Amino acid sequence: MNDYKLFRCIQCGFEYDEALGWPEDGIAAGTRWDDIPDDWSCPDCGAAKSDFEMVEVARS
C-alpha cells in the first residue's frame, strides 16, 4: 500500500503522522508530507519541514 508515513522533528522529537494530519493548522488527515505548505513548522519548537526525518515503521 501507499502507507502513511511518520516524520520526526530532529530538534524536539515531535512526530507528524500523514494519517492524522494537523487539523489545528488546517492540515487534513491524509496530507502527504510534500503537500504540506512550507509556511508550516513543527508545532512544538518551530523548526521547518526541512528539519524532519522520515521514521521507519513496522508492518501492521
Contact flag: residue 58 with Zn ion (CB under 5 A): no
**Closest approach of Cβ 2 to Fe ion, in Å?**
26
Q: Which is nearer to Zn ion, 20 or 49 (CB)?
A: 49
> Which segments of the chain are extended strands (E)?
6-9, 15-17, 52-55
Contact of residue 1 among Fe ion, Zn ion, none (CB under 5-8 Å per partner type): Zn ion
Cα distance between residue 56 and residue 48, in whole Å: 20
Cα distance between residue 5 and residue 17, in whole Å: 6
**Closest approach of Cβ 22 to Fe ion, in Å?**
13
Residue 25 marked in a binding site: no
